UniProtKB/Swiss-Prot annotation, chain A:
Keywords from the UniProt entry: Antibiotic resistance, Cell inner membrane, Cell membrane, Membrane, Transmembrane, Transmembrane helix
Protein name: Multidrug efflux system permease protein Rv1217c
Lineage: Bacteria, Bacillati, Actinomycetota, Actinomycetes, Mycobacteriales
Membrane topology: Multi-pass membrane protein
Protein function: Probably part of the ABC transporter complex Rv1217c-Rv1218c involved in the resistance to a wide range of structurally unrelated drugs. Probably responsible for the translocation of the substrate across the membrane.
Localization annotation: Cell inner membrane
UniProtKB/Swiss-Prot annotation, chain C:
Subunit composition and interactions: The complex is probably composed of two ATP-binding proteins (Rv1218c) and a transmembrane protein (Rv1217c).
Keyword Membrane: yes
Covered residues, full protein: 5 to 219 of 311
Disruption phenotype: Inactivation of the gene leads to a 4- to 8-fold decrease in minimal inhibitory concentrations (MICs) for ethidium bromide, novobiocins, biarylpiperazines, bisanilopyrimidines, pyrroles and pyridones.
Species this protein is from: Mycobacterium tuberculosis (strain ATCC 25618 / H37Rv)
Cellular compartments annotated: Cell inner membrane
Function: Probably part of the ABC transporter complex Rv1217c-Rv1218c involved in the resistance to a wide range of structurally unrelated drugs. Could be involved in the efflux of substrates belonging to the diverse chemical classes of novobiocins, biarylpiperazines, pyridines, bisanilinopyrimidines, pyrroles and, to a smaller extent, pyrazolones. Probably responsible for energy coupling to the transport system.
Membrane topology: Peripheral membrane protein
Lineage: Bacteria, Bacillati, Actinomycetota, Actinomycetes, Mycobacteriales
Name the record gives this protein: Multidrug efflux system ATP-binding protein Rv1218c
Amino acid sequence: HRGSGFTGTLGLLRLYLRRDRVSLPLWVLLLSVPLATVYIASVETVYPDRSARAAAAAAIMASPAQRALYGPVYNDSLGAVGIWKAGMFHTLIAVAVILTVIRHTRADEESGRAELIDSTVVGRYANLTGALLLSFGASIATGAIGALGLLATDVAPAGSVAFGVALAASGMVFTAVAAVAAQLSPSARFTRAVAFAVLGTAFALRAIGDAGSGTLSWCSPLGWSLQVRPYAGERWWVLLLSLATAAVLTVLAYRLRAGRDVGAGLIAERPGAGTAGPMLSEPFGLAWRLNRGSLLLWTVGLCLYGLVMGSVVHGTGALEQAFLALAFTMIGMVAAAFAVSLTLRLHQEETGLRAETLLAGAVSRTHWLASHLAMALAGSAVATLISGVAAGLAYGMTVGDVGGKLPTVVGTAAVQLPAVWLLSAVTVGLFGLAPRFTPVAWGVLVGFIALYLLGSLAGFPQMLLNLEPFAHIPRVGGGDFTAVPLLWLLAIDAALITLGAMAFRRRDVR
Amino acid sequence: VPIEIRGLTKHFGSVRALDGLDLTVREGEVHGFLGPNGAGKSTTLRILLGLVKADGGSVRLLGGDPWTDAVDLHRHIAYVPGDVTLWPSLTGGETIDLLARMRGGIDNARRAELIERFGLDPTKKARTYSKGNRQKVSLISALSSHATLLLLDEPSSGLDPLMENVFQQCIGEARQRGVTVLLSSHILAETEALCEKVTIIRAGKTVESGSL
Amino acid sequence: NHQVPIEIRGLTKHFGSVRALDGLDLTVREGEVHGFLGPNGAGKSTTLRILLGLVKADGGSVRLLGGDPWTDAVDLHRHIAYVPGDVTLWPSLTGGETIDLLARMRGGIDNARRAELIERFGLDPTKKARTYSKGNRQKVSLISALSSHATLLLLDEPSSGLDPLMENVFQQCIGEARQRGVTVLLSSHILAETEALCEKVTIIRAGKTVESGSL
Ligand SMILES: Nc1ncnc2c1ncn2[C@@H]1O[C@H](COP(=O)(O)OP(=O)(O)NP(=O)(O)O)[C@@H](O)[C@H]1O
Ligand SMILES: Nc1ncnc2c1ncn2[C@@H]1O[C@H](COP(=O)(O)OP(=O)(O)NP(=O)(O)O)[C@@H](O)[C@H]1O
Ligand SMILES: [Mg+2]
Ligand SMILES: [Mg+2]
């Protein structure tokens, strides 16, 4: 007696909570503490006289390129100008909550834990409710900590609360999206791709709306957070929108669950072919077969992003250079994440007992490793170069000539490759020395990104900002091109790769 | 009558996984459940746990529906899957304790007896278990509970003859104290010894059923 | 290969404080089905991971097909077919694609035997590999290993999940493989297929050999 579909929710929640106890506090603090200690703290040094701050605002509203990345500035108050740069924090929290929800809902359910858990006295909706409670709690805690940190500074206290609540709502909207996406396919990667396509589309719509009239920025959950307008006249009712979209979607994520069976999705499966083709006869063919969809989807997404970013560059060549070099660094980071995932394909292959099946044949350990390494090194390069070509074409058309604006934008994209491949090198080095600690390449990449963002803005010495690759990339166009750091970033990569290879041939595949 | 399947049916895509089944297990008896590798034995056991949602027929598990009453029924039921997967980080004793906490009850006087009898080493990470000590975790976690209905999919797979004999004696002792068992074997040597009244299904439907 | 496919002398391996193997001995002799028996935790799978070069031995001598299992693990692996204790397939590949893929990295598939093996195990080779019951998931490995160029089969519980008739088809397949000079090493816990198939059983207890000889 006394049983419902939500039984076991608290137990599942606590055993999800203790699984990531070194990851959740780290990013919860990372997305909230550097709001009053970095962004607002470093605005009385860069922009002291208020007469100067106003000038900075007049340099943002007169350039669609800068307000496509970050958004518009509506007045010259200390809070608004200080927190303009931190409008990128509404996307990182969405990434974090999407990853958490998928990790705790569908990744486990694909490993057979659903059978073991649900064979007990654990309800049907306990697994979903536990992950939703964890993500909602994390996204509320980060907003609360950010608001509490901002309330101790000398900015207006209403805008601080508005920004905290907006940051919380931005992460609550994209938890229901992750749940609905998780109710769709038996494969976790397909669900992650579906969830991230929505975020990419929202960001693109937001950027196109910001860089123009502003009508198109009302059709995306990102860009519902900037129109709360903290420090510039708060529109409180906008949060209600972020409260409806989250409530309407999270109901659907339950209605899609009361009609699937543990393990399946929404569409049944289809028969394949009863014979392998002349391409699937090798580790290279097998690795290609497993990554076709990922390669195509990443390539299409990066091409569209480059096409979007190239149109706003020209609504004086000393500012388009600075904006292209700043916009392609983000593409470099995204391609680095692509490379890290394509290389973690290897750890996921070994930990799934499928590496010993392949290695018990006439396959060597280096020919197997250099079949995922060769895909990680090539797919990221192809995607980055295609994005650069698309950006060059879009920029060239809107100016008047293409042959004078394409090569420079292609070079700008092609000089990011040594920094992109360093994370593949790091992952390969970790897989071969400490295979269990392979997935800390994600932490290394997040640390590099955090250092790049919060480096020369909190006053760190210029010998501590040299511990990252994204700051050493040269500047193509005019002078300032050296090509020496690239030679220092390629060599490192090779060394690391070699190390990993040499540490894999003398090991146990256990 | 713990189980009263009367006409089950299930389609996955265009695949007729189950096409009319008539299982019937009564109180305090061990029941065999046999058939070739397409029959639908593992699917039926998943329908009884409210995990698959059968497309037709009637299922009265312990007097109630398995789908809409799953939580209430699952406090009298234990399950041993055909493919046992554990948590690699946790220990065997930790896994048994955690599964006892979810079930809300265990018999420690029998837990210790089974642990020292199956030969399990309860202080080892579950990832080091050699496919024969991985089945012992499920067997001990299911045979030491308060369930009055056991559904075993392939309880002795990976177990050497001595441990299989131990499992047979354990099932005999369980049947002594009024416990109902439904057993899928593919091994007609323990089916002959342990249970009477087998049931055979060929293509999703019952072909024969009755006392041995 | 000195007409002795396998020759182990004083094998040893520790996994930290755990003494997995403590002096194991073996000798398989070019043409016979050999039974590899022992309790749980004896060290049966680990030995099969040392012959394949996946795991390195701390002591003793191993001579697989006249060569070192660890350094020559590529040219010796095209005369060998292996069936693991835990069969895992790629969930996106088809059942009939996995057979061809696996049999191509070994010495190569035989299309005359493949058709008649799929015919009599009753496999459906056009179906994704995440929908196979535990028994059609084993037929994939069995058909892929029994239809290949191989002068040595290392089977590790090959009839796990097979109904009384598909494991009687497998016995006939092994018996007619032995006819054309194929050496088999058979690890199992069912002492009913060992009696019918194997002579020269070998029983190990805790990494050490406690019994050996013809049946
Ligand atoms: N998720 C699924 N999607 C599609 N078909 C499935 C799925 N699960 C099972 N089937 C099919 O349904 C039928 C019943 O499978 P199953 O009941 O698991 O076999 P079984 O009774 O367990 N025999 P055994 O192989 O010895 O365990 C088989 O034809 C399977 O291929
Ligand atoms: N990675 C490992 N780390 C530590 N101990 C291990 C590891 N792998 C195996 N062992 C131990 O080594 C011993 C031998 O196990 P194993 O080689 O799997 O024998 P086994 O015959 O395959 N067991 P079984 O398949 O049931 O007959 C056991 O005590 C295992 O617990
Ligand atoms: Mg089954
Ligand atoms: Mg074994």
